[PDB]
Amino acid sequence: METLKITVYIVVTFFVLLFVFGFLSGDPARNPKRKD
Amino acid sequence: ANLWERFCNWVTSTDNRLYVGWFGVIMIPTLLAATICFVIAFIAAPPVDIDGIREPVSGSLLYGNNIITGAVVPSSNAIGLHFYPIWEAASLDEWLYNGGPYQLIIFHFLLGASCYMGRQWELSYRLGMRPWICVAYSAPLASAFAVFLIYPIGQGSFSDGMPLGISGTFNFMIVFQAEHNILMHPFHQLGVAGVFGGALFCAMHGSLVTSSLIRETTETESANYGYKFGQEEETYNIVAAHGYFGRLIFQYASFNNSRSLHFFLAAWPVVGVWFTALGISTMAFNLNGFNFNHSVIDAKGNVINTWADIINRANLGMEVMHERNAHNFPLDLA
Amino acid sequence: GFAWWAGNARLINLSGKLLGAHVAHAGLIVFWAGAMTLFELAHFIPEKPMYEQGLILIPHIATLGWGVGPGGEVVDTFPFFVVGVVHLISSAVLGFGGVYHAIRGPETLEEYSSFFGYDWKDKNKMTTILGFHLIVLGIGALLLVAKAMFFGGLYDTWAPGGGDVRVITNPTLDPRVIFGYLLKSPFGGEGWIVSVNNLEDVVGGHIWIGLICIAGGIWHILTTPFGWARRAFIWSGEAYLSYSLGALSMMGFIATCFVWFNNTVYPSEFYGPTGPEASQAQAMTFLIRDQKLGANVGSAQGPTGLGKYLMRSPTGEIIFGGETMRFWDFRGPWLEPLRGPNGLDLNKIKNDIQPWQERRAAEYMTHAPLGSLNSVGGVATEINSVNFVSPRSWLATSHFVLAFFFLVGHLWHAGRARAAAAGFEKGIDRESEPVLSMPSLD
Amino acid sequence: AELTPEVLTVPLNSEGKTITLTEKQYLEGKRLFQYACASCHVGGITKTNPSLDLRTETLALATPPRDNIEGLVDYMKNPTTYDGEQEIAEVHPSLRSADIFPKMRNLTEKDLVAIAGHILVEPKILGDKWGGGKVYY
Amino acid sequence: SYPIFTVRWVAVHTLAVPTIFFLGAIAAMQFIQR
Amino acid sequence: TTGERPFSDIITSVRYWVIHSITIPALFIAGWLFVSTGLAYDVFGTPRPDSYYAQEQRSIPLVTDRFEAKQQVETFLEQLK
Amino acid sequence: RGWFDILDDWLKRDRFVFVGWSGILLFPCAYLALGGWLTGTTFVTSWYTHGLASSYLEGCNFLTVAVSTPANSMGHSLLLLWGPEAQGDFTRWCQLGGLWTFIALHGAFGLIGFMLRQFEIARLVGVRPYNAIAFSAPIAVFVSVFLIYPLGQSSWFFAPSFGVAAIFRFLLFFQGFHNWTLNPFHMMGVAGVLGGALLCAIHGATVENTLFQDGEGASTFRAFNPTQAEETYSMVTANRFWSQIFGIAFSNKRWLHFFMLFVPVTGLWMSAIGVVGLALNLRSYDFISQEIRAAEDPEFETFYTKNLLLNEGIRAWMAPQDQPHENFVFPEEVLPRGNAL
């Protein structure tokens, strides 16, 4: 069970940081018209 | 050309057959987890002690259920609002008996569907669209939050969350009516107006456009081949649509501006459904439908029943029978 | 470019008229606090619990220690009057600045003084305005600390002897406790910051937040945003409004749960019992009634096989039986005397229940926060008679509704702000449709 | 049908003397009963002890008899258990316990009579519904 | 030059005349006592 | 556009309000009287607060016959007289 | 140039409210159904047919007022004012439920008139008559519920009464007595009404957020012209959006708007069929296999068995006051009740 719990903690943290850093990576600039 | 930057470009690519996006990065795993657990529990979960009284309700197909009667059963009332992940159970057998799958499914779904709505914002920005389709979807999304999360919180138990089943849904709406008189609640009445009205205007608008299609075909072929995907001209006559509809009622009750017409189409059911979601969300805090029980009495003080009193006799029949073994004390305060 | 129905969007780059809008609207807020308080006092009857009387503002004042003594007995109504009057009066001053700046003052500010003027895109000026307001907010939170420690105390539902006003001499400063709350699960038996159950921790956290807010206020006056923040955010007035709408929404959802679950900073004496509280009070009531008749409540097996009056929680604590099993995390000053370290102590239940606990349970059970929209108290099948909806139901529902629309407002404005920043908020350019220059999906 | 004097006429004491309320007193009593009593006794039941109700036959069988103005006014002063054996002012609203039951503090002597009057008249109007419970709603 | 009495006139007053009359009856009713 | 006079132009006209400042309260008073005089009760057969049950009656006077129903309610109404 | 033609001319003049030949049926019947409902809900009781108060005069409010169905002892009597029941007496006619049949029958002929109007105007304007066709769904519902359902039952008494709370009671009757939620024709209706509301919202939102920039202002409504030839929003961008978000999207505007007609019209048509079944107590009440198992196996419990207990409570608790003509006397001890409640 603890193996499972650690694994889920890892998987969730990984995806949440992809999300946080993905949007921190110049997201307003990824549009078709005007980029900053 | 850097690794992270190439990843970022694939996540946000407008060239993937299905858009991923940063909201997608959370949606996909969580909807897959909720879907996969749901499918397996619906088919094969053993019975679950929804009401915490050691009286397991059988919800899956292999335990004698059909598509209509089956459900994933809400977790045990003994758990109330406690978090019950798999790793908090001594074993999967315990987790199954107490209704663990329900919690896994609803949390992942609510999360994934929240990200679904964000994903709608995001791709609209990637495509140079206006951004508010996601606002339309917040009305269904709010509704799901109300019956899977808000109503348990206010009542103190996911055991009173809505069941993931066809007949479970009916059990939920019957108990809701007896504990909250939802039919006499104005926000539910606005939902019905939003939903009846939405179906009405769907039919109206589809019938009005269809009536004014410009002849582009012969009687031997679908009229639908009169429109070609991407064509620049419009494919019906809106003035002819307006001239029929304005005369069916009167001129000024008809729309001659398609932008106002289509925004009306959007707002009417969205706002009705916000209200009916608000209704569930506020009856979660027990601010219930209008109560006119014995509001008409005569000169002596006899009660003169109205239809509200008859409704009450039905509510009473629901109240006294629901969860027939769970109450030891005379008032069902939650 | 805005129609009449979006006409307040015409103020976006008119800093003077927009200042008047904000200050006049701030007067409306202070007006209602004042008027509503005076309406409640006019209608207040002291012999009646507040929660039988439709009061939402008097309970907030009593909770700060004014006008009440032991048990929430209202001792002195004048503080209530004072609070109303000063608010009502102060709104005229804000009304006055409001209509002045909105109608007569300079439309735009930045030409008059370069201090009060602003451009939304001036990232430095904007963090400075932010900082001033952070310091103000920090000051406000310390005002609460000052009242608790130096100017009379706060009402403490937990005070030994039925509740009373008490000065807080040892605010919790330990950050393991203060910030420990911020990391508790929001789920049941934990309840995140909603579970704060003593005024030491309430006062202590307001010390932290005051200092944090002042600190950050000075930070933002002194700095400009870093590049990673420059590139992640939209810098525009609508965008800033959308950020605040999201924060207001989140806060409104928290307050909903606060007023529905917490009986410390919403004492039940004033607001009525919580849902869980009332449900536990019914099990207490019949446990008392049945034991007096001779029932052995510890050994009484109910229909299901579970205890009729007492059972175990999933972790073993002895708890009230029946449907209220779901509410065993409830803690209230009328109940805790019966609790040992295994939960409810059978020997205290047999021997030590006091009449004031029998009374409090009967009262809270008959004042459960259930009621119709037209204020008929009780379950929905109850007949007319009792004119009652709990202040907690009124406060929870109102703010859930408000919190929800503010979230919608956040999505509305945040999306618009994005599209306005990229330049397609008004629609697609027919000569430059992005999708028509993209490859086909299939 | 209407609120006639015959219905407004209720036993004063156990001797058998009667008293005729006015419509005023009756509506006075109803109001006061909602103010001080209905939270537990809506409809003639007792939410916190459903075994004891306010039907006239129940009151008649209480010790001392409570099916009359005197017995009821006394009950509001010095409530006892159904068999008369213990005084329960500590846990039942009463004039004797108005320090702890503050709603009873402004009840005057004729308020008590109106309240006791309401309780005795209402069964005559409502029949089984009074003290009958949800079965009769 | 506009007509005064039309089909329109008639449909209007078909509805509006009894509305007001009905509103007045329903107004009196709020003062009925048992 | 159809040749009737525009509504906007009618309800700002002095002549209009000269008639309807009389016709509108007369109808409002008219309907008031229909109730205040008791005529509405008698026209429609609606019971008054005092005529739902006879004094000691708690029986609904429910119609129970098709072609004798007129005679039934007539009997129930005298059981009050 | 005969009179018939002259009348045609006058009926079909362009005026603020078009009249038509169909106006001759529509306008009197619509005005009378509507006036009957406002007359009954303001002044008329239900005391003699139902044991209920049902007008403002009596103290009811907008939610509880109703024009109630006739007494069960009337059977399916037309209850004509001049018929053998009321015998020309307006008052008794009111007291016996005559306004229920007045409204229902005049409503029926009004609905016919309204659909004839849709046909009449569509012919004069030169458009296809799909709005009339669509309107067949409301008609089907009205006849099935207000006419066929009670004609299969013992009397008009068991039709819906024309009121807000009375209809709420009609909903709950159907749950407890017919188990109508279990009925697949109701389910197809639910999917058509909810599916339709979805379509209405998703289509309106899509157009409003794929708009072309055809004006300089921030209010985008100004930039449409009803006679412009150009589509006012991008089907192309709309299609790519939904294809990428949902996986499929519409590509054919014509099919899209036909589907919008099709979904809610069919749903309503399906539910009508199921209510025709219920005219005969031809219910989808039970699943036989579940009952046989649950009779034998007292540990077997589903949401299906849970909901029948609820239906059973409903029937026994509402029946005596809801069917006063049956003189049901259920003593306390026979009422179904769970523990404590």
Ligand code: CLA
């Ligand atoms: C801090 C709060 C806040 C602020 C400052 C703004 C500010 C703005 N909004 Mg946003 N908005 C908010 C919250 C806020 N909004 C919320 C919570 C929502 C979700 C409901 C929205 C949804 C929204 C939309 C959809 C739009 C705006 C728009 C705008 C702009 C023009 C608004 C205008 O002129 O309204 C004018 C005000 C009215 C027409 C009156 C509305 C009255 C409401 C609907 C009735 C409420 C009545 C009450 C409940 C009961 C009545 C009782 C009875 C007795 C009367 C302006 C920049 C517009 C925009 O994008 O422009 C940039 C726009 O289109 N807003």
Ligand code: CLA
């Ligand atoms: C809190 C509510 C609020 C506030 C504070 C504002 C504030 C403002 N609006 Mg918005 N607005 C609102 C609600 C609000 N609005 C709503 C609900 C709508 C939808 C109907 C609009 C629609 C709208 C439009 C369409 C426009 C504005 C504009 C403006 C600004 C200029 C108004 C002007 O010159 O009028 C002049 C008005 C008068 C001279 C009439 C008298 C008004 C006074 C202030 C009444 C106050 C009386 C009070 C009792 C006095 C107390 C005095 C005492 C304190 C000393 C101003 C800042 C305008 C703008 O942006 O201009 C660039 C504009 O074009 N508003």
Ligand code: CLA
């Ligand atoms: C946050 C609100 C706010 C803001 C930013 C402004 C900003 C401004 N005002 Mg406005 N004003 C406000 C509120 C506000 N005012 C209110 C509430 C009123 C009515 C009382 C006015 C009445 C007013 C007038 C009559 C005039 C201005 C003018 C001006 C400008 C010059 C200010 C100056 O140099 O004064 C000098 C600064 C001081 C004398 C310092 C004042 C210190 C105050 C009194 C104490 C502050 C403490 C605290 C914040 C108050 C809370 C106490 C309470 C909670 C108990 C400036 C842009 C002038 C202008 O624009 O002319 C074209 C002008 O003529 N204002």
Ligand code: CLA
């Ligand atoms: C009104 C409050 C407020 C607002 C609007 C801002 C706004 C801003 N701050 Mg300041 N700040 C404030 C208060 C505030 N600040 C205070 C009081 C302090 C003192 C502690 C600071 C200290 C501070 C520093 C030290 C810095 C900023 C910076 C910034 C900028 C970037 C913000 C950012 O990216 O956050 C977005 C936040 C993240 C991307 C990471 C946050 C992750 C959290 C933990 C998520 C938790 C959410 C969860 C659902 C709720 C539960 C909470 C949990 C802890 C239990 C921005 C202008 C930056 C800047 O450019 O300064 C020049 C910067 O470096 N702020």
Ligand code: CLA
């Ligand atoms: C024009 C539209 C219209 C339609 C379709 C109906 C239809 C109906 N009405 Mg309604 N009615 C209308 C207008 C309409 N009414 C108007 C304008 C009024 C106001 C006066 C009323 C007032 C009214 C009342 C008060 C009642 C009805 C009733 C009815 C029902 C029975 C009618 C009946 O039995 O006919 C029978 C008669 C005919 C079908 C006439 C046929 C004509 C033939 C072809 C010619 C005969 C000529 C003659 C015999 C020869 C001369 C004789 C000699 C002496 C020279 C039916 C649903 C009843 C109802 O709803 O019951 C619940 C009812 O009680 N109607």
Ligand SMILES: CC1=C(/C=C/C(C)=C/C=C/C(C)=C/C=C/C=C(C)/C=C/C=C(C)/C=C/C2=C(C)CCCC2(C)C)C(C)(C)CCC1
């Ligand atoms: C007073 C008090 C207290 C204390 C308190 C405290 C101390 C608190 C704190 C609080 C805090 C500490 C808070 C925080 C918050 C945060 C947040 C809320 C965040 C947010 C974030 C965001 C929003 C972000 C986003 C993003 C991303 C993710 C990516 C990129 C983009 C962006 C940036 C947008 C206590 C309890 C003891 C008691 C009572 C009283």
Ligand SMILES: CC1=C(/C=C/C(C)=C/C=C/C(C)=C/C=C/C=C(C)/C=C/C=C(C)/C=C/C2=C(C)CCCC2(C)C)C(C)(C)CCC1
């Ligand atoms: C039956 C009959 C008949 C007929 C009748 C009629 C035809 C009548 C009519 C009637 C009518 C014609 C009536 C009317 C009424 C009205 C009403 C009563 C109204 C009211 C309304 C209101 C109250 C409104 C208000 C409001 C609200 C509430 C909210 C929103 C807004 C508004 C403003 C809308 C005859 C003679 C043949 C004979 C036989 C029998």
Ligand code: OEY
């Ligand atoms: O309505 Mn009735 O109340 Ca809300 O709990 Mn008490 O009984 Mn049981 O658990 Mn599901 O259900």
Ligand SMILES: [Cl-]
């Ligand atoms: Cl159930």
Ligand SMILES: [Cl-]
């Ligand atoms: Cl229980």
Ligand SMILES: [Fe+2]
């Ligand atoms: Fe369309």
